[PDB]
């Protein structure tokens, strides 16, 4: 696939933004549980994912599901400063917060806003998270790394078409990927509280960690 084709494939594969119906945690779990179903079908449409073995596809999803949920949350909350848009009907401020996770997500959202993160870049990062989060845990790894290299070329391709010099391209690429480290951090800490205070699908997701 070309760089243009990579983006078009990812953009059209985007999951919908779902709505929501101890008080707060009931809603979020219900929301995440419905989102997980869409994430799975989204994962299949991510170029190169279904080429992997069924065993590997689940390991990747089991390790990255919360990261993918969180970066999605951070993304839709971009143009809503100081608040987290869990759903179009569920916009929460910091005060309504576990608040340590909220502050990190807000920081990431404000980080995306400062960087003017484009949707085309977002679907790349999200797909990168899916393929990367479980890869370090042989011919299949060569493939995953080949797809990752393809997504890297795609990211660079996007930045070059936006009039960025090759220095700014290389800087922005780094800036985007360094954020994935924070997203991993937020996920592990989120996972750490999720396992503390404990639907069907999400149980296999939580027990994986």
């Amino acid at each position: 696939l070309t760089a243009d084709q990579m983006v078009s494939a990812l953009l059209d594969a985007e999951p919908p933004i779902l709505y929501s119906e101890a008080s707060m945690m009931g809603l979020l779990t219900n929301l995440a549980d419905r989102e997980l179903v869409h994430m799975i079908n989204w994962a299949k449409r991510v170029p190169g994912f279904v080429d992997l073995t069924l065993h590997d596809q689940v390991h990747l999803l089991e390790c990255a599901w919360l990261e993918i949920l969180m970066i999605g949350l951070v993304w839709r909350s971009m143009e809503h400063p100081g608040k987290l848009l869990f759903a179009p009907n569920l916009l929460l401020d910091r005060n309504q917060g576990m608040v340590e996770i909220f502050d990190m997500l807000l920081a990431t959202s404000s980080r995306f806003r400062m960087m003017n993160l484009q949707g085309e870049e977002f679907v790349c990062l999200k797909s990168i998270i899916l393929l990367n989060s479980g890869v370090y845990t042989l011919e299949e790894k060569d493939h995953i790394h080949r797809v990752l290299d393809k997504i890297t070329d795609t990211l660079i391709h996007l930045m070059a078409k936006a009039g960025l010099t090759l220095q700014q391209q290389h800087q922005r690429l780094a800036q985007l990927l360094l954020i994935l480290s924070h997203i991993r951090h937020m996920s592990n800490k989120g996972m750490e509280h999720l396992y503390s205070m404990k639907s069907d699908l999400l149980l296999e997701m939580l027990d994986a960690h």
């Binding site: 799975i40 994962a43 299949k44 689940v58 999803l61 069907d200 699908l201 149980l203 296999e204 997701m205």
Partner: peptide, 9 residues
């Protein structure tokens, strides 16, 4: 468990 069912079809 569940996951290898949903993704299989």
């Amino acid at each position: 468990k569940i996951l290898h069912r949903l993704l299989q079809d």
